[PDB]
Amino acid sequence: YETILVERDQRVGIITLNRPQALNALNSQVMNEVTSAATELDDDPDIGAIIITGSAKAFAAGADIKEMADLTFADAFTADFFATWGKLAAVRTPTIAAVAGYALGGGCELAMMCDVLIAADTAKFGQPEIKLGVLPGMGGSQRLTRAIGKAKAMDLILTGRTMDAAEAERSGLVSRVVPADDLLTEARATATTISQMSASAARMAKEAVNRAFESSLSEGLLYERRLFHSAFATEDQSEGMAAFIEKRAPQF
Amino acid sequence: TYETILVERDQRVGIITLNRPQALNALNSQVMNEVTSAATELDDDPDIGAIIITGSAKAFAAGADIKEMADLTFADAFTADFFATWGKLAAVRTPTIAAVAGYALGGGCELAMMCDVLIAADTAKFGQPEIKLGVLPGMGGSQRLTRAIGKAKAMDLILTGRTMDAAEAERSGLVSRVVPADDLLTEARATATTISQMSASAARMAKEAVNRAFESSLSEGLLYERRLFHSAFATEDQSEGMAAFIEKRAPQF
Amino acid sequence: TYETILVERDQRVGIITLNRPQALNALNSQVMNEVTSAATELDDDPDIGAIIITGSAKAFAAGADIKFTADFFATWGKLAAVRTPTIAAVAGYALGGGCELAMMCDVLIAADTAKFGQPEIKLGVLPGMGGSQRLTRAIGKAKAMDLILTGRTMDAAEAERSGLVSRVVPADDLLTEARATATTISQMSASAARMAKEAVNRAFESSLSEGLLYERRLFHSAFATEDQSEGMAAFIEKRAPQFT
Numbered sequence: 148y149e150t151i152l153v154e155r156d157q158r159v160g161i162i163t164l165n166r167p168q169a170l171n172a173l174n175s176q177v178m179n180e181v182t183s184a185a186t187e188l189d190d191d192p193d194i195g196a197i198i199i200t201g202s203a204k205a206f207a208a209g210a211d212i213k214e215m216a217d218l219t220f221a222d223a224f225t226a227d228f229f230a231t232w233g234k235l236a237a238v239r240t241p242t243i244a245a246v247a248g249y250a251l252g253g254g255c256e257l258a259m260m261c262d263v264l265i266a267a268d269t270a271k272f273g274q275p276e277i278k279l280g281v282l283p284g285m286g287g288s289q290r291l292t293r294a295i296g297k298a299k300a301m302d303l304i305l306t307g308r309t310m311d312a313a314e315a316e317r318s319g320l321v322s323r324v325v326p327a328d329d330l331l332t333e334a335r336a337t338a339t340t341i342s343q344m345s346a347s348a349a350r351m352a353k354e355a356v357n358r359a360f361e362s363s364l365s366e367g368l369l370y371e372r373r374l375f376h377s378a379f380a381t382e383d384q385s386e387g388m389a390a391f392i393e394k395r396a397p398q399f
Numbered sequence: 400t401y402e403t404i405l406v407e408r409d410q411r412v413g414i415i416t417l418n419r420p421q422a423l424n425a426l427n428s429q430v431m432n433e434v435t436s437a438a439t440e441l442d443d444d445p446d447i448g449a450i451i452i453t454g455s456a457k458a459f460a461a462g463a464d465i466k467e468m469a470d471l472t473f474a475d476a477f478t479a480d481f482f483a484t485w486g487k488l489a490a491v492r493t494p495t496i497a498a499v500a501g502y503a504l505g506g507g508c509e510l511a512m513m514c515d516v517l518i519a520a521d522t523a524k525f526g527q528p529e530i531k532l533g534v535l536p537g538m539g540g541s542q543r544l545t546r547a548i549g550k551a552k553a554m555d556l557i558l559t560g561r562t563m564d565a566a567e568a569e570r571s572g573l574v575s576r577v578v579p580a581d582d583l584l585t586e587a588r589a590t591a592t593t594i595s596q597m598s599a600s601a602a603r604m605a606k607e608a609v610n611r612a613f614e615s616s617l618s619e620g621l622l623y624e625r626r627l628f629h630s631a632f633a634t635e636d637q638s639e640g641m642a643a644f645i646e647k648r649a650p651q652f
Numbered sequence: 653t654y655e656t657i658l659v660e661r662d663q664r665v666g667i668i669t670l671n672r673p674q675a676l677n678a679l680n681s682q683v684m685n686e687v688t689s690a691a692t693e694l695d696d697d698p699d700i701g702a703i704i705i706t707g708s709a710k711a712f713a714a715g716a717d718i719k720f721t722a723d724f725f726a727t728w729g730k731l732a733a734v735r736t737p738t739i740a741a742v743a744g745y746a747l748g749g750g751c752e753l754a755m756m757c758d759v760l761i762a763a764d765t766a767k768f769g770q771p772e773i774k775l776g777v778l779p780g781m782g783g784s785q786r787l788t789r790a791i792g793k794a795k796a797m798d799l800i801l802t803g804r805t806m807d808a809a810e811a812e813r814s815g816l817v818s819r820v821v822p823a824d825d826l827l828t829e830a831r832a833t834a835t836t837i838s839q840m841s842a843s844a845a846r847m848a849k850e851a852v853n854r855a856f857e858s859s860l861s862e863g864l865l866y867e868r869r870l871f872h873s874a875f876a877t878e879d880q881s882e883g884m885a886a887f888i889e890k891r892a893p894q895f896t
Contacts, residue, residue, distance in 0.1 A: 216888060222875070262550070263558065280877065282844055282847050288852045288855065290550075297855075298815065298816060302833075304851075305737055306837060317570050322555035337555075344558070352536075355535055356545050359553075364613035367542040372537060375535060379468075379476045379534075387531070548792075576798065594801050597776070604778055606800075612796070617857055624778070625725065628724075644775055
C-alpha cells in the first residue's frame with residue numbers, strides 16, 4: 148500500500164494512515180486501501196479486532212481538496228463519490244479508532260465510522276466542510292448529531308469550530324480519553340481484550356448495537372432478543388457459560 | 400407474599416426491593432416473574448402514583464443466574480422466548496424510578512435502564528459483562544444503553560465488559576441524578592413522592608410522550624405529543640392545577 | 653410594528669428579541685405569531701444568513717402563558733421550517749414553552765445564569781411545543797423523564813454536559829458571543845449552510861442508513877453550486893472565499 152501501513156499482532160490488525168506530508172488527509176486512494184485492508188482483515192479468522200490510527204500529529208486532517216476541486220454534480224453522481232467508505236461500516240469484526248491530534252472533516256467522520264473510539268488527550272475533532280462551500284459527505288451530519296446532540300452538532304457543522312478531547316468525551320463522541328503517549332498502548336490493550344472474546348459473540352454484540360440507529364426501540368429490542376436466542380446455538384455460549392460456572396477461564 | 404422481593408406501600412409510592420443478598424440480587428426467572436407481577440399490581444392500583452425499584456446498598460443487581468441459561472438450546476430459547484416477560488415492566492403506565500446502589504451489571508444494568516427515572520448512588524457501577532460469557536445483552540442492553548450514552552461508549556462497554564462509575568453515567572446520559580449512598584433511598588422516595596402527587600393521568604401521559612421519542616420520527620413524535628396535549632384539557636386536573644397556581648398554593652388532584 | 657418583540661438587522665444577521673419583561677417574556681399567541689412572522693421574513697430576506705432569538709438577561713422566556721379543532725400551538729411549527737440557521741441565546745429563565753422554543757433552534761448558546769425546565773406537569777398539563785421529543789433526544793431518557801415528571805430545573809452546566817446546549821458563556825458576554833457565532837455562520841455560503849442544517853435535521857427523521865444516503869446526495873448536489881467551487885479554489889489558493 149502507498150498510503151497506509153498494516154500489521155498483525157496476534158489477533159489484532161492495525162491499519163495506520165500513512166501520508167505524513169499531508170497530515171494523513173483522506174483521499175480516493177486512502178479510501179480504497181483502508182477499505183481493502185479492513186475488508187481483508189475482516190475475512191481473516193485469526194483477526195478478532197481492528198485498530199485504525201494515524202500519526203501522533205494527525206489522525207486525519209480532512210479529505211484531499213484537489214481531488215474534489217474540479218468535480219461537477221455529474222462526476223459526483225456518477226462515481227457516487229465517497230460511497231466506497233460504506234465498506235468500512237460493513238466490517239463485521241469490531242473496529243477501534245485511536246485518534247491523536249487532528250481528526251477533521253473526513254477524518255472526524257472516519258473515526259465516527261468505527262465502533263470504539265479512543266482519543267489522546269491532544270485529540271481535536273471538527274467538521275470544517277462548510278468553510279469550503281460544501282457540507283460533510285462521509286456521514287458527519289448523521290453520526291455526529293446522533294453522538295452529541297443537535298445543539299453541538301449544529302454548532303460544529305455550521306461554524307467549523309473544533310472540539311477538544313475532553314468535550315468530545317463528555318458529549319458522547321469518544322469512548323475514552325488517554326494521555327497522548329499511551330494512546331497506542333491503550334488502544335491495543337483494548338483491541339486485545341476484544342479479540343480475546345468469542346468471535347461470534349463480539350460480531351453479534353456489535354450488530355445488535357448498530358441496530359439502535361436503524362429502527363424503533365421496539366424493533367431493536369426484538370432484534371436483540373432473537374440474536375440473543377441464536378447465541379445459544381453456538382459452541383462459544385456453552386463454553387463461555389460453563390467456564391464461569393466452573394470458576395475457570397473460558398477457552399473458545 | 401413473594402420469595403425474592405419485598406413490596407411495600409408508602410402512601411402513594413410503591414417500593415419494590417430485590418431481596419436476594421446471597422446472590423447479590425442476581426436476576427433469574429423467579430425475580431423476572433415476581434418483579435413484573437409486583438410492578439403490574441402497583442400499576443393497576445389507583446392508590447399508587449409512582450414505583451421505585453432498588454436492591455441493596457451493595458448491589459442493585461449483579462448479573463443473572465447463569466445456571467438457568469447454561470444448558471439452554473436455541474429451541475429452548477425461541478420456544479420459551481427467554482426474557483420476553485421483562486417487557487412487562489416497560490408496559491407499566493405509572494412512572495418507575497430505579498434507585499441504583501453498588502452493582503448494576505448485565506441484567507441489572509438493563510433492569511435499571513427499563514425504568515423511566517434513574518437515581519444512582521455514589522457507589523453505583525454499571526456494566527454489560529454478557530460478552531465475557533459468550534453471549535450478548537438480551538434484555539435491551541444493546542438498545543437502551545446505546546441510545547442513552549452513544550455508540551462509542553456503548554460499544555466500549557458491551558465489547559469489553561468494562562464498568563462505568565456513577566460520575567461517568569451521569570455525564571453521559573445513563574442516569575438522572577447522583578446522590579450520596581446514605582441518601583439514595585431517601586432521595587428516591589422524595590422524587591417518587593413528587594411524581595405521585597402530580598395528576599396521575601397527566602403523569603402517565605407525560606411518560607408516554609417521552610417514550611414516543613424512541614419509536615418514531617421527530618415529526619411523528621411531535622404530532623403525537625400535540626394530540627396528547629389537547630386531550631389533557633379534557634380533564635379536570637387541569638382546572639385544579641391552574642387554580643392552585645393562581646392561588647399560589649398546592650394542588651389537590 | 654411589533655408589539656411583543658424587537659427586530660434588528662446587523663449585516664447578514666437578524667436578531668429577534670422577545671420584549672415583554674412585564675411577564676418575563678412569557679409566550680402568548682401574539683408572541684408566537686410575531687416571532688414566526690419575523691423569522692419567516694428574515695428567512696426570505698437574501699441579505700440575512702443567520703437569525704438569533706433572545707429574551708432579556710433575566711429570562712429568555714419564563715414559560716408559556718397559562719390562560720383538535722384549532723390545532724393549538726401549531727403555528728410554532730413554522731419556526732422549524734425556517735431554512736436559514738437559527739441561534740437561541742438563552743439568559744436566565746427558559747421554562748416550559750421557553751425551553752421548547754430554545755430547543756426549536758439549531759444552535760443554542762446559554763448564559764451561565766440559564767435555567768432550563770419543563771414545569772408543565774405541575775399545572776397538570778404536558779409540554780405541547782415539542783419538549784417531550786426534542787428534550788429526550790437531546791439529553792436522553794433518564795433526564796428527560798426526571799425533568800418532565802418532577803418539573804425540576806437544569807442549570808447551564810448540566811445542560812452543557814447533557815447535550816441540551818452548544819456552549820456556555822458568561823452572562824455579560826452572551827449577546828456578543830451569540831452575535832459572533834451568527835456572524836461566522838452568516839459569512840458561510842448560504843446554500844451550503846442551508847444544506848448543512850437540513851442534513852443535520854434528517855438525523856431525527858429516519859434510520860441512519862437513509863440519513864447517510866440523503867447527506868451524500870446533498871453533498872453531491874453541492875458540486876452544482878458556485879460556492880463549492882469558490883470555497884474550494886480559495887482553500888487551495890490559500891485565500892479568502894468570496895461567496896455569491
